[PDB]
Amino acid sequence: IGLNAIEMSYLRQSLSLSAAQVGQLTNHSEAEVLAWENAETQAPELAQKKLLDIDDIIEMQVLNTTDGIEALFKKEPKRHLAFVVYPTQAIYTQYNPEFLSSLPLTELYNTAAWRIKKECKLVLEVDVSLINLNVEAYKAYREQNGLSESRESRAKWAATQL
Amino acid sequence: IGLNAIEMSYLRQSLSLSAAQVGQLTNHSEAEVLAWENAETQAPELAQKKLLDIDDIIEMQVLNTTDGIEALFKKEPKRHLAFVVYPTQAIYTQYNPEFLSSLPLTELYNTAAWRIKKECKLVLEVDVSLINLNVEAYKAYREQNGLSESRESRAKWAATQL
Ligand SMILES: [Mg+2]
Ligand SMILES: [Mg+2]
Ligand SMILES: [Mg+2]
Ligand SMILES: [Mg+2]
């Protein structure tokens, strides 16, 4: 069953995307997106699939991350954890080459992060703080601890920000 | 403590609200909301609680509605369902006096509707389509079929749209 006007609008909003961003993602103009969100046209099936696929990707990330936290908790039962997020699109792109193909926009990663925070609270009773990467503080921390720039080093830094 | 800038921003966006709408809900200016979302200021405790309470109310509505749909289909055959939503603030207000103190804005009810559609599909493999109330058509439908104004009557009308 195809997605209608309201559904496409609320799918978009659940992803923290603007209409223009959806246009860019689906190869349509902002006006075309607004039209289908106003029921003035039916969204092309490829456009629907693109947004559904992104939501599916985020959902997998939420489940996978929560599973990871749970498995780690079985060895180290810490109930306060950091999850690193990125302050701007530019820094997101610079630091996260492996998310860009499926989640090219920092808004998408932030959306996943919020959903992970919510899920961990509900299912694991773990408090996940969303920690914006502070590049200067992070660099200075790496220099003090002889760390190279990696996801693991970002995490280690983030943990000090709780 | 409490919610930080990024957490408040993505909580807001998950509720499909503009910064101005958060301002209206929490009795602060739009500029103030944007300032806390950019970590220039801290969101007041009362503002955080308003949004978190709204999210909890929606979440309860999602679980209870989906469970209610499952029970319904223990008694009659599973079918593609319509779910009524309200296209303007005025229309939402007119038809939902009992939701207004808890979900004051129609965007919140739409958000609940979208989450219900998603949950029904994933957990029950049940298809739900969102249908905006059209006042003129609904009124004529009630007259033709001898129905009084009720949520059940709105739902019966919405099924004719599928
Ligand atoms: Mg087009
Ligand atoms: Mg696909
Ligand atoms: Mg879950
Ligand atoms: Mg249940």
Residue B50 falls in which region: left (phi positive, over 0), alpha (psi -120 to 50) or beta: alpha
Q: Is A112 on the interface with B (CB under 8 A)?
A: no
Domain borders along chain A are 1-162
CA–CA gap between residue B104 and residue B102 (Å, rounded):
6
A14–B114 CB contact, under 8 Å: yes
Tokens 């080459």 locate to A97
What is the stated resolution of the deposited model, in angstroms?
A: 1.7
Token pair 């969101």 is at which residue?
A: B43
Q: Which approach determined this entry?
A: X-ray
Nearest CA in chain B to A2: B129
The answer to whether A58 touches A111, Cβ cutoff 8 Å, is yes
Asked if A15 contacts A111 with a C-beta cutoff of 8 angstroms, the reply is: yes
Choose the closest CB to B132 out of A6, A13, A130: A6
Q: Which residues contact B50 (CB under 8 A, 6 or more apart)?
A: B25, B26
- How many CB atoms are closer than 10 A to CB A101? 8
CATH number of A1-162: 1.10.3100.10
Residue A33 token pair: 């997106």
CA of B46 to the centre of ligand 4 (A): 31
* SS3 of chain B: CCCCHHHHHHHHHHCCCCHHHHHHHHCCCHHHHHHHHCCCCCCCHHHHHHHHHHHHHHHHHHHHHHHHHHHHHHHCCCCCEEEEECCCHHHHHHHCCCCCCCCCCHHHHHHHHHHHHHHHHHHHCCCEEEEECCHHHHHHHHHHHCCCCCHHHHHHHHHCCC
B66 in A contact zone (CB under 8 Å): no
- As separate numbers, helices (DSSP H) first and strands (DSSP E) second, chain A gives 8, 2
Q: Find out whether B37 and B7 touch, Cβ atoms under 8 Å.
A: no
CB B63 within 8 A of CB B115: no
Distance from C-alpha of B9 to C-alpha of B12, rounded to nearest angstrom: 5
CA distance A85 to chain B (A): 9
CA dihedral B22, B25, B28, B31 (to 10 degrees): 20
CB B15 within 8 A of CB B55: yes
C-alpha distances (whole Å) from B155 to each of B70, B71, B117, B134, B161 are 17, 17, 15, 12, 10
Taking the Cβ of residue B12 and every Cβ of chain A, the question of whether any pair is shorter than 8 Å is answered with no
Q: Give residue A15 CA to ligand 1 midpoint distance, Å.
A: 21
Residue B127 assigned to a binding site: no
* Contact between B147 and B141 (Cβ < 8 Å): yes
Taking the C-alpha atoms of residue A30 and residue A113, their distance in angstroms, rounded to an integer, is 27
Report chain B residues whose CB lies below 8 A from the CB of A114. 7, 10-11, 13-14
Task: Give CA–CA dist A53/A19, Å, rounded.
Answer: 17
